[PDB]
Design a protein around this ligand. Structure first.
Ligand SMILES: O[C@@H]1[C@@H](O)[C@H](O[C@@H]2CO[C@@H](O)[C@H](O)[C@H]2O)OC[C@H]1O
Ligand SMILES: O[C@@H]1[C@@H](O)[C@H](O[C@@H]2CO[C@H](O)[C@H](O)[C@H]2O)OC[C@H]1O
Ligand SMILES: *[C@@H]1O[C@H](CO)[C@@H](O)[C@H](O)[C@H]1NC(C)=O
Length: 319
């Protein structure tokens, strides 16, 4: 009947979509987001980030995040919660602080404890740390890495695990979906967390790909298995496949085969629990404002109509 029913038929936990609060006032959008044939899981695109949830130190703000959880709860959808420690979308107080290891650690831990406890029981997974790596596999020079060092990553995991012992704790990153230094470094982050003694349950593969330059099914699968071999689960967390504009029939067909291979890679890897697309309609994609000249990244167009990519995903799911 749809992407999520097809996904569950193959043993995945869900097919899902990100969303954001301004889109929840569009009744046609909400109708399809709420179609559980297609979406069994929701991620908030913005309202669980640090700037949204802790705009001032120890001053938490949950209304916008809770509005997304309320929509998922209405529909019986699972939630992925996104994201606790990330260098982007930080409030001014974090980025402008004069910190010591001890003072920034205390602020970070308090952020994690508060936000994870707030959403205790409500999340399938958290993206505990996002985007910790450079492309060469070195650590990104975020405030957290500059002040705390590598230990910030396992400390974050351990803090989240104390606050909610049942939720799956993920490390989430982009360009870790294909073989290379960054993916190896992400495997090493799993290993480092466990060597510290902290819990990590999953690796989140963003999957922000480009039409005609998408990793192949074989390389996707080799990489997924490289993480599941470590005793963690995997998911594609932010899938979109942006095209160089303008859209054409040929590019739409190529985008279908690109999405097809991602779904098929996940089915072929035991331990791949699901796929989340980063929103579901081109109308609301983040892409065009960030990647100049690119767009039309999703399985529905800006008029809420299925594109050939929808059929590619169904075909990759074996439906
Ligand atoms: O609305 C936008 C969001 O869709 C966007 O989300 C980020 C996209 O890049 C991924 O790497 C991040 O993990 C994800 O949160 O953030 C910017 C915002 O304007
Ligand atoms: O906020 C960041 C973006 O800067 C980032 O961009 C990558 C760069 O390498 C690629 O071409 C990949 O397709 C892009 O998505 O993307 C993720 C986002 O976190
Ligand atoms: C910060 O302190 C923790 C001990 O609380 C430690 O694990 C970490 O390595 C320290 N980092 C730096 C740069 O001192």
């Amino acid at each position: 009947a749809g992407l999520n029913t097809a996904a569950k038929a193959k043993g995945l936990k869900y097919f899902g979509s990100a969303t954001d609060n301004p889109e929840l006032t569009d009744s046609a959008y909400v109708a399809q987001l709420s179609n559980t044939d297609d979406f069994g899981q929701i991620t908030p695109g913005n309202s669980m980030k640090w700037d949204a949830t802790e705009p001032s130190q120890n001053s938490f703000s949950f209304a916008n995040g809770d509005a997304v959880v309320n929509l998922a709860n209405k529909n019986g959808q699972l939630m992925r919660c996104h994201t606790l420690v990330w260098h982007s979308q930080l409030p001014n107080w974090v980025s402008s602080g004069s910190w010591t290891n001890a003072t920034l650690l205390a602020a970070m831990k308090n952020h994690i404890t508060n936000v994870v406890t707030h959403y205790k029981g409500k999340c399938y997974a958290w993206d505990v740390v996002n985007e910790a790596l450079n492309e060469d596999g070195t650590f990104r020079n975020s405030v957290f890495y500059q002040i705390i060092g590598p230990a910030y990553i396992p400390i974050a995991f351990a803090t989240a695990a104390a606050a909610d012992p049942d939720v799956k704790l993920y490390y989430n990153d982009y360009n870790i979906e294909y073989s290379g230094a960054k993916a190896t470094a992400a495997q090493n982050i799993v290993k480092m967390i466990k060597a510290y003694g902290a819990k990590i349950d999953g690796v989140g593969l963003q999957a922000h790909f480009i039409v005609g330059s998408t990793p192949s099914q074989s390389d996707l699968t080799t990489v997924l298995k490289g993480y599941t071999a470590l005793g963690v689960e995997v998911a594609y967390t932010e899938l979109d496949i942006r095209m160089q504009l303008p859209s054409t029939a040929a590019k739409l067909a190529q985008q279908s085969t690109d999405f097809q291979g991602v779904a098929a890679a996940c089915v072929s890897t035991t331990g791949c629990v699901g796929v989340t697309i980063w929103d579901w309609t081109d109308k609301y994609s983040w892409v065009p404002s960030v990647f100049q000249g690119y767009g039309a990244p999703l399985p529905w167009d800006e008029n809420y109509v299925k594109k050939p990519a929808y059929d590619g995903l169904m075909a990759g799911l074996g439906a």
